[PDB]
Amino acid sequence: VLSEGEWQLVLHVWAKVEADVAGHGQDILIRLFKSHPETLEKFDRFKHLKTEAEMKASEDLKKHGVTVLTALGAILKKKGHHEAELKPLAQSHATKHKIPIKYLEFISEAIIHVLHSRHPGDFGADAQGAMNKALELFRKDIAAKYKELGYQG
Ligand code: HEM
């Protein structure tokens, strides 16, 4: 459970993300894809991309990055009271996209990395810790829905 102070650190850097959601999404998905190639394989939509330049040029990838970050921002703004937002997501990711919880840990790490590169002044160690907690809560809650559905893992 994040404290109010922690939530404030989280949403303060997230307000910064909102200035350029598309650029953040592309950086995050590209980082995810490059660092963990097995993740790109889950995307029939994007598996034709072989290089970072191709990824950076993809308008559809940028479009999905916005979809992803928009869903995550709505979750973060609920400050833990994200039951309704998390349900559709867990259902599709477990049963439809078949995304292991480990891959959610990978994108969390890509998120934290990109937030740090783009917002050093509002992403000091305290903010990083707070964001990590927020992302851990998200994973924890998603994981519980996965287990229920028979996909824990
Ligand atoms: C911060 C975490 C994530 C969020 C908020 C997020 C959000 C979304 C949203 C909003 C959608 C569209 C609606 C839906 O199908 O539920 C979606 C689709 C999808 N997501 Fe995620 N996602 C996350 C992480 C992941 C990860 C890590 C992977 C893969 C390693 C993944 C794979 C997919 C796939 C394959 C689709 C369908 C893409 C398509 O073909 O249109 N997601 N996600």
Swiss-Prot record:
Monomeric. Its EC number is 1.7.-.-, 1.11.1.-. It catalyses: Fe(III)-heme b-[protein] + nitric oxide + H2O = Fe(II)-heme b-[protein] + nitrite + 2 H(+); H2O2 + AH2 = A + 2 H2O. It is an enzyme of class 1 (oxidoreductase). The keyword Heme applies. This is Myoglobin. Changing residue 121 to A: In metmyoglobin. The keyword Metal-binding applies. Its main location: cytoplasm. It comes from Physeter macrocephalus. The modification Phosphothreonine is found at residue 67. GO terms for cellular component: extracellular exosome; sarcoplasm. It is found in: Cytoplasm, Sarcoplasm. Keywords: Cytoplasm, Heme, Iron, Metal-binding, Muscle protein, Oxidoreductase, Oxygen transport, Phosphoprotein, Transport.
